[PDB]
Amino acid sequence: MVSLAQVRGALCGALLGDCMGAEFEGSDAVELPDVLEFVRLLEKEKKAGTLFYTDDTAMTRAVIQSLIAKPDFDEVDMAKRFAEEYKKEPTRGYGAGVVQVFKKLLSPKYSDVFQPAREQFDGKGSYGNGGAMRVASIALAYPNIQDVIKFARRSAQLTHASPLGYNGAILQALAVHFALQGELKRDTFLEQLIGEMERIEGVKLPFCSRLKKIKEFLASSNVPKADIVDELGHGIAALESVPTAIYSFLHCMESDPDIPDLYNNLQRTIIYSISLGGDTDTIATMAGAIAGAYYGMDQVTPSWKRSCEAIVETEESAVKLYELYCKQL
Numbered sequence: 562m563v564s565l566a567q568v569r570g571a572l573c574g575a576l577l578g579d580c581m582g583a584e585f586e587g588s589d590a591v592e593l594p595d596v597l598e599f600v601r602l603l604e605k606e607k608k609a610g611t612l613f614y615t616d617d618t619a620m621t622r623a624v625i626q627s628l629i630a631k632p633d634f635d636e637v638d639m640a641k642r643f644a645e646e647y648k649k650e651p652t653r654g655y656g657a658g659v660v661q662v663f664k665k666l667l668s669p670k671y672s673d674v675f676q677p678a679r680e681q682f683d684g685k686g687s688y689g690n691g692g693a694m695r696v697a698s699i700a701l702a703y704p705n706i707q708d709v710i711k712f713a714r715r716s717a718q719l720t721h722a723s724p725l726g727y728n729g730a731i732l733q734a735l736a737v738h739f740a741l742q743g744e745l746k747r748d749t750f751l752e753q754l755i756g757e758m759e760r761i762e763g764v765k766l767p768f769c770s771r772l773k774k775i776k777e778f779l780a781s782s783n784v785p786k787a788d789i790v791d792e793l794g795h796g797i798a799a800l801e802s803v804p805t806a807i808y809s810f811l812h813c814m815e816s817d818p819d820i821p822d823l824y825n826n827l828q829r830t831i832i833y834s835i836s837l838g839g840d841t842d843t844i845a846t847m848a849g850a851i852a853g854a855y856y857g858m859d860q861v862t863p864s865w866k867r868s869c870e871a872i873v874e875t876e877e878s879a880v881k882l883y884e885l886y887c888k889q890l
């Protein structure tokens with residue numbers, strides 16, 4: 562049985578990843594000393610809540626409020642919350658055309674809540690990671706894997722209608738789902754994900770191909786960050802960020818010689834994620850969600866979490882998601 566510590570851990574890990582990754586976003590190369598300096602300063606900062614969250618958390622909050630209000634999953638409700646959240650705080654960091662989806666949802670001219678997303682990228686749909694960045698809560702609320710898959714997909718399709726976008730969301734949700742189930746071995750976890758993605762996807766199995774590359778990298782020694790960036794990616798594309806977040810989580814189950822030992826696994830996961838550069842708040846928010854689900858609140862340290870905008874509201878929302886989970890059993 563999943564614990565409240567795991568549900569809260571996952572949401573706080575997501576929040577930490579967003580808030581701490583945000584300042585580094587877009588850096589083609591990050592200097593790890595800069596990340597470690599930032600962490601040391603953060604820990605000494607007298608004022609609380611100085612790190613603002615981005616679109617990743619804004620949309621996460623909307624997902625959660627929808628699930629709490631409509632526990633059987635209501636995509637119409639969820640789309641409305643996405644669009645209303647954007648309208649309230651439009652400058653949180655939305656990109657890759659996604660605001661056109663919200664503007665169409667807000668207009669009276671669209672009645673099918675999936676149609677705006679289908680029109681993106683000249684009718685091909687978005688393959689960005691915005692579906693995946695906000696999906697962890699689906700795995701926290703719904704214990705049944707079939708529900709996780711179908712609701713991860715539908716929640717993602719509200720904005721991301723390309724199979725790369727929505728299958729990236731499914732993969733992220735599945736990573737959280739399997740991380741909740743207890744102590745894991747890396748290869749077994751990867752086979753769990755590969756087995757599901759083979760069926761879901763089946764160039765033909767792009768996520769499966771990246772997961773197999775992860776397995777190869779974990780079996781290798783001394784893997785430079787540059788090889789991870791080159792082969793898995795650090796981009797806004799779901800295919801170039803969801804596997805990278807999974808790799809970051811699995812890598813950080815063990816010590817990293819470049820990250821001081823005083824950091825716990827979850828802290829290491831966030832630091833390592835950010836150190837890969839690129840889309841740092843989304844890769845760290847996704848890796849942090851998985852790590853939080855796995856290690857729980859015990860590794861969410863006071864000095865880190867107090868730095869984040871909306872930490873109190875996040876911790877409270879976990880209790881309501883946990884209640885949903887319990888009702889599902």
Ligand SMILES: [Mg+2]
Nearest residue numbers: 615616617654
């Ligand atoms: Mg963001």
